[PDB]
Amino acid sequence: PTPVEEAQQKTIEAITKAINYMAKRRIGALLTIERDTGMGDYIETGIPLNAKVSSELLINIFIPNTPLHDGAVIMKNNEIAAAACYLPLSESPFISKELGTRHRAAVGISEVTDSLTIIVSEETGGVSVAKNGDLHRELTEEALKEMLEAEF
Amino acid sequence: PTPVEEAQQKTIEAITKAINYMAKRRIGALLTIERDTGMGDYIETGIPLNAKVSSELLINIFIPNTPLHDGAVIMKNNEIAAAACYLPLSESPFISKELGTRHRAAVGISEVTDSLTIIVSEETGGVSVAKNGDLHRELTEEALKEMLEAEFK
Ligand SMILES: CC[C@H](N)c1ccccc1O
Ligand SMILES: [Mg+2]
């Protein structure tokens, strides 16, 4: 494939490996992938990383009770742009009432951008995605990978 | 001050803040700063980051029982080049006998490069620096700062 396509595939492999690891351990996570709507305003609220993606770095960021774990990681293409970022909280009535701030933040950013946000619940380990104002819950590993591949 | 000087001071402050946090909690850490001797061969053994330095990222890297905490962070050109890197273990018979692998790795890289390596002991939280084959132990915060400033001058 082209180098761009191979890089995308490595980035998807890194994300899915990290999400699977965190889901199994009930490590809460909030990971927004910038698409065509620029997210600079939100990136600038966090700690700048501009780091190459790896499953290892993604996992290390979200370990509970650490400086970087609260708030969103925002990725730009094949880089982790920043961690511990603010995202706006959705007021949508279609967010399950038991869900906390990570899911509301994910839906919130999905209402004002075309980004794709992945959430791992610290309560259940369930994996969800927010896109275009909708939250899709309880994703299998296969469904998440397919969503990421389709998102390119 | 110049942009480069302000950048160097910001990086020193980020390092010292992270080392203080880890020393207080007795979190083992191993952080090598590349100088004139290139360390690409050791950087290539770790996980690539090429990340901006922050105290927060340094702390998150070394949290125990995590993917990135085992091995050395190597800094180059004011960035974190890679984490979980291999460094060669010193065979020097003159390292304190109570010290283990992190300290021997720091002394080892210091024997074959002009780099400066910071170690935090997981046993005591003591802070030490390896340079030129020697280990400087039980450093105060002021002593570590002076070494970092002397190195970057
Ligand atoms: C308890 C931390 C300790 N005072 C320390 C912290 C950072 C650097 C050196 C050093 O001796
Ligand atoms: Mg369902």
Curated annotation (Swiss-Prot), chain A:
GO cellular component terms listed in the entry, alphabetical order: plasma membrane
EC number: 2.7.7.85
GO molecular function, one term: ATP binding
Summary of the knockout phenotype: Increased sensitivity to the beta-lactam antibiotic cefuroxime (CEF), upon overexpression of the c-di-AMP phosphodiesterase GdpP greatly increased sensitivity to CEF. Double disA-cdaA mutants cannot be made, suggesting they are lethal, while double disA-cdaS and cdaA-cdaS mutants are viable. Depletion of cdaA in double disA-cdaA deletion cells leads to cell lysis. Exponentially growing cells are extremely sensitive to H(2)O(2), no change in response to methyl methanesulfonate.
Occurrences of domain DAC (ranges): 2-141
Induction, as annotated: Constitutively expressed, part of the cdaA-cdaR-glmM-glmS operon.
Description of how activity is regulated: DAC activity is stimulated about 20-fold in E.coli by coexpression with CdaR.
BP GO annotations: cAMP biosynthetic process
Membrane topology category: Multi-pass membrane protein
Primary role: One of 3 paralogous diadenylate cyclases (DAC) in this bacteria, catalyzing the condensation of 2 ATP molecules into cyclic di-AMP (c-di-AMP). Upon expression in E.coli leads to c-di-AMP synthesis. Probably the main producer of c-di-AMP for the cell; is probably implicated in control of peptidoglycan synthesis. In B.subtilis c-di-AMP is a second messenger that mediates growth, DNA repair and cell wall homeostasis; it is toxic when present in excess.
Entry's family note: Belongs to the adenylate cyclase family. DacA/CdaA subfamily.
Name by which UniProt lists this protein: Cyclic di-AMP synthase CdaA
Naturally occurring in which organism (per UniProt): Bacillus subtilis (strain 168)
